[PDB]
Amino acid sequence: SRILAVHASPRGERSQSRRLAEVFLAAYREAHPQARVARREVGRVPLPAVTEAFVAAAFHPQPEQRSLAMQADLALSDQLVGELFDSDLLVISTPMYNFSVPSGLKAWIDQIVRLGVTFDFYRPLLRGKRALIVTSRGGHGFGPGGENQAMNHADPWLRTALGFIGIDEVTVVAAEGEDSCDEAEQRLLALA
Amino acid sequence: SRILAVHASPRGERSQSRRLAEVFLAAYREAHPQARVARREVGRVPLPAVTEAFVAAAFHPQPEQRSLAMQADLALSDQLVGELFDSDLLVISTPMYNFSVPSGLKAWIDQIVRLGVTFDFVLDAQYRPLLRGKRALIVTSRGGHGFGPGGENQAMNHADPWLRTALGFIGIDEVTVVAAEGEESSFEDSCDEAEQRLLALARSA
Ligand SMILES: Cc1cc2nc3c(=O)[nH]c(=O)nc-3n(C[C@H](O)[C@H](O)[C@H](O)COP(=O)(O)O)c2cc1C
Ligand SMILES: Cc1cc2nc3c(=O)[nH]c(=O)nc-3n(C[C@H](O)[C@H](O)[C@H](O)COP(=O)(O)O)c2cc1C
Ligand SMILES: COC1=C(OC)C(=O)C(CC=C(C)C)=C(C)C1=O
């Protein structure tokens, strides 16, 4: 199983979402020694936002006739999509930032949801892929049945976006109160 | 009554959310010649993302003791927050990108939600908003249909509903949403309706 790990926290050593994700990846590597891991940093690296140029090229009515300039505008997107195609398991580590994800992760999603590549018209085009979302939160009760579940626009939105392109087998492991981390940690070891 | 307009679409003349928002601002201008209008571009301008240095600065236990480097890391945030404090009405124009907002608008939000400035907390964490007496108008454009209340795809909409939650957290709980749908394809009717709604809001604000 080939893995694509997308880290969304701008923090490095201090990132809990990053740490917990690495705990899973390490535990998984031991259980599957032949596994490959590709890491795509979107937290500590400023992934470019969608531009009007991107929109013109991505939604170009006839893709084959794109100019070299248009292809250049889509070069990063193609690289990012390719990493996704080449993977079997998608691991996303992300904090909750203002009831959603950090802007860098939104930028990544906006690059890999591509007409005619990951979706068409609406139907998904990705198949046989699973996702694991490892998230960290300062507050409490954003999970299923929580007092503040309706305010959660982070992982539940990722489900929607990922589901739209065909990734419908998604698991979310969440730590709150920043004991919950230990539960998350142990949970992740079992999954690996 | 002072207005802050935040445009989130990367498109210019062809941005429908920008166009509709400008219809409101112009109509408002006609009814209030003395009113001040400030524009903050987050769509055609790449707003910096929250970094680790920003987190270290914004959550510093003794904010008075921040080094000049730390203050530099917060200089943009301080400017963005200030524009908001100076405003009575906030106008956000935004597309729906992949069931949420463009990353640039998310970045703007992440800059203006600030500990001890736009929100605070005490330990008993019990959060408190610090903005008062302000209102917001969200003008949005969508390619598909049914993302509004009662719509078939309502549960998929993580854009304007999410903006409501984030804005409410810092104290802006009076929020109006004007949406146009079917841009991908009727749309002329949706736009005309949104226009009439905005012209009415402008005349009465
Ligand atoms: C800019 C910013 C926004 C945040 N917004 C929320 C939030 O909306 N809800 C919440 O529960 N925690 C919020 N937090 C707290 C973080 O989610 C929490 O500290 C988390 O552990 C960070 O994960 P990390 O260690 O991987 O960086 C926020 C933190 C920052 C820096
Ligand atoms: C990257 C991208 C993602 C989009 N995602 C959605 C979507 O999830 N749902 C939808 O109804 N329309 C979606 N659209 C269509 C836009 O919402 C629509 O074209 C809108 O009018 C753009 O706003 P603007 O005219 O202000 O630029 C998307 C468009 C782009 C370019
Ligand atoms: C920095 O910004 C924010 C936090 O920082 C720690 C939070 O914990 C939270 C969590 C709030 C709840 C209701 C527990 C929010 C919402 C937030 O915006």
Author numbering:
A (entry chain B): 2 to 122, 131 to 187, 196 to 209
B (entry chain A): 2 to 125, 129 to 189, 193 to 212
What does the paper say about this structure?
The structure of paAzoR1 bound to AQN was solved at a resolution of 1.8 Å with final Rfree and Rwork values of 18.5% and 16.2% respectively, while UQ1 was solved at 2.0 Å with final Rfree and Rwork values of 23.6% and 18.5% respectively. In both structures, the quinone is only observed binding to one of the two active sites, although positive difference density is observed in the alternate active sites there was insufficient to unambiguously build in the model. During the refinement of the structure of paAzoR1 bound to UQ1, the occupancy of the UQ1 molecule was reduced to 0.5 suggesting that UQ1 was not present in all paAzoR1 molecules. Like AQN, UQ1 forms π-π stacking interactions with FMN and makes hydrophobic contacts with Phe100, Phe120, Tyr131 and Phe173 but it also hydrogen bonds with Tyr131 via the quinone oxygen and forms extra hydrophobic contacts with Phe151. The binding orientations of UQ1 and AQN differ significantly, with UQ1 binding parallel to the ring system of FMN while AQN binds at almost a 90° angle to FMN. These differing binding orientations correspond to those observed when methyl red binds to either the wild type enzyme in the case of AQN and the Y131F mutant in the case of UQ1. The binding orientation of UQ1 is also consistent with the binding of both balsalazide and nitrofurazone to the wild type enzyme. In the case of UQ1 a δ+ methoxy substituted carbon of the quinone ring is 3.5 Å from the N5 of FMN making it an ideal candidate for hydride transfer which corroborates the previously proposed mechanism of quinone reduction based upon comparison with azo reduction.
Azoreductases are a related but previously thought to be distinct group of NAD(P)H dependent flavoenzymes that have been identified in a number of species from bacteria, to mammals. In order to help understand the mechanism of quinone reduction by azoreductases the structures of paAzoR1 bound to two quinone substrates (UQ1 and AQN) have been solved via X-ray crystallography. We have shown the azoreductase family are very active NAD(P)H quinone oxidoreductases with broad specificity profiles and as a result they may play an important role in detoxifying the quinones secreted by many of the host organisms of P. aeruginosa. paAzoR1 has a preference for benzoquinones e.g. Bzq.
